[PDB]
Short mmCIF file of C-alpha atoms and ligand atoms in Angstrom, two decimals:
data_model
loop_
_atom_site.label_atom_id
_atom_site.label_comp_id
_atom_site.label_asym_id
_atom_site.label_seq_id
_atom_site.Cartn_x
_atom_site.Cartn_y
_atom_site.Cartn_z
CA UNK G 1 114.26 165.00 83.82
CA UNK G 2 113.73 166.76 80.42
CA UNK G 3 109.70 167.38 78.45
CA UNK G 4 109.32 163.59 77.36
CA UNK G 5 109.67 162.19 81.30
CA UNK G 6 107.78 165.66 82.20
CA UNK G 7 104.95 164.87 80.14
CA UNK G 8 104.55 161.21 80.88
CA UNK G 9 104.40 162.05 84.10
CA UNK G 10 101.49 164.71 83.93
CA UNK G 11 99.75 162.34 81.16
CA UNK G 12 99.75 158.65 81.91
CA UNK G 13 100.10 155.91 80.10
CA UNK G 14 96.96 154.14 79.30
CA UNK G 15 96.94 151.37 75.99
CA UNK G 16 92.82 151.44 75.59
CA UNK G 17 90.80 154.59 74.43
CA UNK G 18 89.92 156.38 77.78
CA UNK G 19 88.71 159.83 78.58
CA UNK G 20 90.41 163.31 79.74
CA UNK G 21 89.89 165.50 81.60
CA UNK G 22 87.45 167.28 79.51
CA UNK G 23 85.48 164.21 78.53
CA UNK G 24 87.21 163.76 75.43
CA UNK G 25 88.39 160.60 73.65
CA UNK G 26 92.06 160.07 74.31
CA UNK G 27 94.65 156.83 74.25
CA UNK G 28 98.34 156.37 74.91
CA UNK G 29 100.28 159.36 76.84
CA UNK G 30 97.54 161.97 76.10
CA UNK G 31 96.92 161.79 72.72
CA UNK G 32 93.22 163.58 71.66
CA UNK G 33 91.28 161.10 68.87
CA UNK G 34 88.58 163.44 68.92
CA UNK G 35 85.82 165.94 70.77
CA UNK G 36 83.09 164.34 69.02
CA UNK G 37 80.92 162.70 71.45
CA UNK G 38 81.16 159.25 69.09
CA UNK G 39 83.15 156.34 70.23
CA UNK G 40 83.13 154.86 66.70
CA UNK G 41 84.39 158.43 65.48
CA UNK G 42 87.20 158.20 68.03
CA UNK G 43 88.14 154.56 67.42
CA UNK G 44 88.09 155.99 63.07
CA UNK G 45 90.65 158.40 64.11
CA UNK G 46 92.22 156.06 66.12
CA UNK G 47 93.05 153.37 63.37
CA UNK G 48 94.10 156.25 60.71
CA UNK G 49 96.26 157.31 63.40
CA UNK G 50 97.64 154.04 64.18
CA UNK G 51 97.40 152.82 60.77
CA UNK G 52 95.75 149.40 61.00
CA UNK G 53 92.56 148.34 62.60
CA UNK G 54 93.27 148.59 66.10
CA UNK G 55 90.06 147.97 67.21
CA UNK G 56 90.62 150.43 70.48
CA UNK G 57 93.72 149.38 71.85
CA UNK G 58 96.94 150.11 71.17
CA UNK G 59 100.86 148.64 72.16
CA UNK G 60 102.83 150.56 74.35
CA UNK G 61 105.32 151.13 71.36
CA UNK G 62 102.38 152.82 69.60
CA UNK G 63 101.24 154.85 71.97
CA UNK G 64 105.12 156.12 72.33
CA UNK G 65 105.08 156.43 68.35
CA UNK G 66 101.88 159.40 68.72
CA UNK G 67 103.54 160.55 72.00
CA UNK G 68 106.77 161.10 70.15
CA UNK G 69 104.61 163.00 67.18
CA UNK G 70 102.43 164.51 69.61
CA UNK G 71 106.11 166.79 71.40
CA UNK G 72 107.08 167.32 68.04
CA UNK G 73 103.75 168.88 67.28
CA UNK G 74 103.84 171.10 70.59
CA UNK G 75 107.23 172.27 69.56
CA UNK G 76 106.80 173.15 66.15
CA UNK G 77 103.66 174.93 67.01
CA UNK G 78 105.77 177.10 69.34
CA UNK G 79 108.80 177.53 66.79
CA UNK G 80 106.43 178.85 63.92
CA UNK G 81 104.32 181.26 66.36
CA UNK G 82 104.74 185.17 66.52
CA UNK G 83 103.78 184.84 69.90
CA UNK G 84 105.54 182.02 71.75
CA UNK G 85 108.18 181.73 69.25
CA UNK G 86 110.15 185.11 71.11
CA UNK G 87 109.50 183.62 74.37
CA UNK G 88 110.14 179.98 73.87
CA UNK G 89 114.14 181.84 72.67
CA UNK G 90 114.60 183.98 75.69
CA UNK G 91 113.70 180.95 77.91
CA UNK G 92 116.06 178.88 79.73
CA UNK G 93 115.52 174.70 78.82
CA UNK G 94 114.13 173.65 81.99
CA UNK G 95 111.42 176.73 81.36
CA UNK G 96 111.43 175.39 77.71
CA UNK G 97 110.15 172.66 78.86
CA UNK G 98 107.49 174.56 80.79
CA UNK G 99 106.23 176.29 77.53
CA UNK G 100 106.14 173.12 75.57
CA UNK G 101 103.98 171.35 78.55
CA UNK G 102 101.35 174.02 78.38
CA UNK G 103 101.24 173.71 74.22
CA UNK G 104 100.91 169.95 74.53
CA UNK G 105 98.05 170.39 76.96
CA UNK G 106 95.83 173.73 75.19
CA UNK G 107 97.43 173.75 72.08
CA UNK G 108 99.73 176.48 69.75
CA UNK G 109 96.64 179.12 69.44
CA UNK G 110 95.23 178.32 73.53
CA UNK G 111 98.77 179.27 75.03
CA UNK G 112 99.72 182.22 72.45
CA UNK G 113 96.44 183.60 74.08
CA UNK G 114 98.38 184.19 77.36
CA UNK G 115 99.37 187.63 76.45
CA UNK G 116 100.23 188.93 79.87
CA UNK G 117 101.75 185.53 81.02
CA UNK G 118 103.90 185.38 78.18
CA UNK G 119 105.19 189.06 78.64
CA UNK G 120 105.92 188.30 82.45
CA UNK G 121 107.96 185.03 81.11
CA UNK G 122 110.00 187.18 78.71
CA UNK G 123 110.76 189.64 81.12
CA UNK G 124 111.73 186.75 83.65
CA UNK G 125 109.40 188.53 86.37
CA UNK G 126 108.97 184.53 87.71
CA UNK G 127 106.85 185.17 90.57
CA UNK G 128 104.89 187.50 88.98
CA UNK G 129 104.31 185.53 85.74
CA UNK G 130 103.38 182.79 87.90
CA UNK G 131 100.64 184.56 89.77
CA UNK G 132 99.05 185.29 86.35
CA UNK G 133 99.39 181.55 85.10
CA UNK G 134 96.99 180.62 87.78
CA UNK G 135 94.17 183.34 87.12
CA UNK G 136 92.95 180.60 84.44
CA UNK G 137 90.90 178.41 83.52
CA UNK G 138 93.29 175.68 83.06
CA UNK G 139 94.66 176.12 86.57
CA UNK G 140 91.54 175.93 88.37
CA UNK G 141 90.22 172.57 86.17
CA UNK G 142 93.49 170.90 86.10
CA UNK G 143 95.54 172.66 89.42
CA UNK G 144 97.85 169.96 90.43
CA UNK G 145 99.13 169.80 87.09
CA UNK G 146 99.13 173.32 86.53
CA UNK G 147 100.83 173.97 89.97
CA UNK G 148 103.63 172.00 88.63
CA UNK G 149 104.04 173.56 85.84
CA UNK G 150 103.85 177.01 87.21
CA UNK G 151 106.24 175.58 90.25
CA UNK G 152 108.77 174.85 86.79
CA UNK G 153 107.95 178.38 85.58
CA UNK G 154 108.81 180.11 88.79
CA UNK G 155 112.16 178.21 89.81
CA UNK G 156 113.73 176.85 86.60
CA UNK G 157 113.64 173.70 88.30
CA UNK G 158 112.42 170.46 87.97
CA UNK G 159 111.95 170.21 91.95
CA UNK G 160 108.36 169.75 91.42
CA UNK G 161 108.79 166.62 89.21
CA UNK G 162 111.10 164.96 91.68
CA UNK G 163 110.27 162.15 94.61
CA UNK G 164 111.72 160.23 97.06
CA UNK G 165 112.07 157.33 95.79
CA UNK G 166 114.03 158.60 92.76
CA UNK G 167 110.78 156.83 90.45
CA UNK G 168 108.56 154.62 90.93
CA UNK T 1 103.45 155.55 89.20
CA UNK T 2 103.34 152.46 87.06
CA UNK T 3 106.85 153.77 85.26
CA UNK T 4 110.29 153.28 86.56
CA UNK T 5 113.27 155.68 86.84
CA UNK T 6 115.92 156.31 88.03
CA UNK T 7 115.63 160.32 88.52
C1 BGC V 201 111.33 147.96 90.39
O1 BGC V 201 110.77 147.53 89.17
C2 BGC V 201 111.09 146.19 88.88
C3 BGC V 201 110.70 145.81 87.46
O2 BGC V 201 109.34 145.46 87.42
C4 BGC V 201 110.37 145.29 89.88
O3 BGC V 201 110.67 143.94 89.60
C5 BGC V 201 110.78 145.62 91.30
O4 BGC V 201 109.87 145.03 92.21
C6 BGC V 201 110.81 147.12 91.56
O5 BGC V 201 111.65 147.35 92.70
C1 RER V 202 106.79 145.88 89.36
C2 RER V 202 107.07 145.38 90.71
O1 RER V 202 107.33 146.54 91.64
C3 RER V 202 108.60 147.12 91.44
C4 RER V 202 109.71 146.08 91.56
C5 RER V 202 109.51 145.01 90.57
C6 RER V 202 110.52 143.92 90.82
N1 RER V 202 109.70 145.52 89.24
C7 RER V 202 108.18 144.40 90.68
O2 RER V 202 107.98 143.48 89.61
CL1 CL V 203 95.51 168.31 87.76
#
């Protein structure tokens, strides 16, 4: 396990524009095109993104291709942060992983608002910092997700990423 | 699912 298998996991794959969990325009592994209620905005984005006329659906390359971008985005948002920046460095790389999850999701600014969360996590009270995760928003509109995430905060584990059958 | 593995 590591964030890339993490992430695919809490975000799907899907090659035509679909939409979150918010009602947003989205394609690929949980890449945003836009909040704007327009479908032709979202498909504009979509081709700049893409860079051809895609007309709506994209290749499973491409949608790996924005994925890729879209990590690298999470973790340089962390890395040039006041905030999660001294956090993201006194974590651990399966909690790492944690922090760059909840970035990818809410965004640099959303998840540098988590002032007493992120305290908790750099003070490595686990249980406790996990308590406060869940008083949110974000756990209560998206809490199977958020459970595992927190579950990865808490233990340092990837236990709650893990099945049975090994994949599937 | 819809992925592959192994984990
Ligand atoms: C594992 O995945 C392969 C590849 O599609 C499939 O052929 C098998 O049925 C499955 O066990
Ligand atoms: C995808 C299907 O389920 C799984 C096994 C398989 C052979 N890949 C099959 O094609
Ligand atoms: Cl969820």
């Amino acid at each position: 396990m590591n964030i890339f298998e993490m992430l695919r996991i809490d975000e799907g794959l899907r090659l035509k524009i679909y939409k979150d969990t918010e009602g947003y325009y989205t394609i690929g592994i949980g890449h945003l095109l836009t909040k704007s209620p327009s479908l032709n905005a979202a498909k504009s984005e979509l081709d700049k993104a893409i860079g051809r006329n895609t007309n709506g659906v994209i290749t499973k390359d491409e949608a790996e291709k924005l994925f890729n971008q879209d990590v690298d985005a999470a973790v340089r948002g962390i890395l040039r942060n006041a905030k999660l920046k001294p956090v993201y460095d006194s974590l651990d790389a399966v909690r790492r992983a944690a922090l760059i999850n909840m970035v990818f999701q809410m965004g640099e600014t959303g998840v540098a608002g988590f002032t007493n969360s992120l305290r908790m996590l750099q003070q490595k009270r686990w249980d406790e910092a996990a308590v406060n995760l869940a008083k949110s928003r974000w756990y209560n509109q998206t809490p199977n997700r958020a459970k595992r995430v927190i579950t990865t905060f808490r233990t340092g584990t990837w236990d709650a990423y893990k099945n049975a059958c090994k994949x599937x | 699912x819809x992925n592959x593995x192994y984990x």
